[PDB]
């Protein structure tokens, strides 16, 4: 198994993961799969780390669970349908519109 025990975890956005992998690539050569991960992460990060983490915090401040807030920051929904894609088999948030305003606010 990986270690003796997992003390805790935190879901991270693709944007933050991309910067974390960038740092890893600076200390040594990456394996093929690590390289694929870096390529994917850099291509699908829609904001820099700072902004992505700021967006997740704003969403969390509204009571949105961490995992979902991160997914929203990764996707950057532009309308209700995008939110419906995220909230699969889940009822849309009563704050659906506010979320879109904030997402359309990474500005």
């Amino acid at each position: 198994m990986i270690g003796k025990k997992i003390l805790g975890e935190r879901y991270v956005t693709v944007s933050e993961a991309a910067e974390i992998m960038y740092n890893r690539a600076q200390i040594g050569e990456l394996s093929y799969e690590q390289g694929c991960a870096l390529d994917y992460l850099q291509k699908f990060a829609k904001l820099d780390k700072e902004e992505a983490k700021k967006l997740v915090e704003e969403l969390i401040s509204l009571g949105i669970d961490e995992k979902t807030a991160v997914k929203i920051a990764d996707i950057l929904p532009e309308d209700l349908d995008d939110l419906r894609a995220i909230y699969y088999k889940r009822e849309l948030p009563e704050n659906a519109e506010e979320i879109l305003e904030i997402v359309r606010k990474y500005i």
Binding site: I2, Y11, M21, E33, F44, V70, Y88
Partner: protein, 177 residues
């Protein structure tokens, strides 16, 4: 999904390394031991981000290594059932399209790409009635419908509303405006 995990462990440091920086040596050992590993519950270990704590070394008889208790941070990729993802098509065959999700790829079986009669063109997947095309390089939004990680197979689908090649989704939005 991507996660940063805090892990407690015990790292074995060989005597040949006693003169080198402890933290750097421990980090190197952890990288060689865990990076690249794929665990059903944890996911794919992408990087040992940092070592946050290293306790005093313990030595046991018959062994010349120093065992140090440690806490390290690691970045992992973990696919989750019914998860909404976005990725790039890296291969298109007669039985489907492979999509990169990070260190692992998912497969959209040919019959789960679009609601239309499709055919593989050796010279991309094309829809006969819609004219929609999916080829290497395209970006897609899909949902994970099957996961089998072996320390692997990740099945994807776009045959649900709000899923598909990003351009198809953008077009739909334009029509609905």
């Amino acid at each position: 999904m991507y996660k940063i995990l805090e892990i407690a462990d015990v790292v074995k440091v060989p005597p040949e390394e006693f003169g080198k920086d402890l933290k750097e040596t421990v980090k190197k050992i952890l990288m060689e031991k865990y990076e690249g590993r794929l665990d059903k519950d944890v996911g794919f270990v992408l990087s040992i981000v940092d070592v946050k704590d290293i306790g005093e070394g313990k030595v046991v008889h018959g062994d010349g290594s120093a065992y140090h208790p440690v806490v390290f941070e690691t970045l992992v990729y973990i696919p989750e059932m019914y998860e909404l993802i976005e990725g790039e098509v890296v291969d298109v065959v007669e039985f489907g399209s492979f999509v990169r999700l990070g260190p692992l790829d998912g497969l959209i079986h040919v019959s789960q790409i679009m609601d239309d009669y499709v055919s593989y063109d050796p010279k991309a997947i094309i829809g006969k009635e819609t004219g929609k095309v999916l080829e290497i390089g395209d970006y897609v939004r899909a949902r994970i419908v099957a996961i089998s990680l072996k320390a692997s197979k990740i099945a994807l689908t776009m045959r649900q509303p709000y899923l598909g090649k990003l351009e198809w989704i953008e077009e739909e939005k334009a029509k609905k405006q």
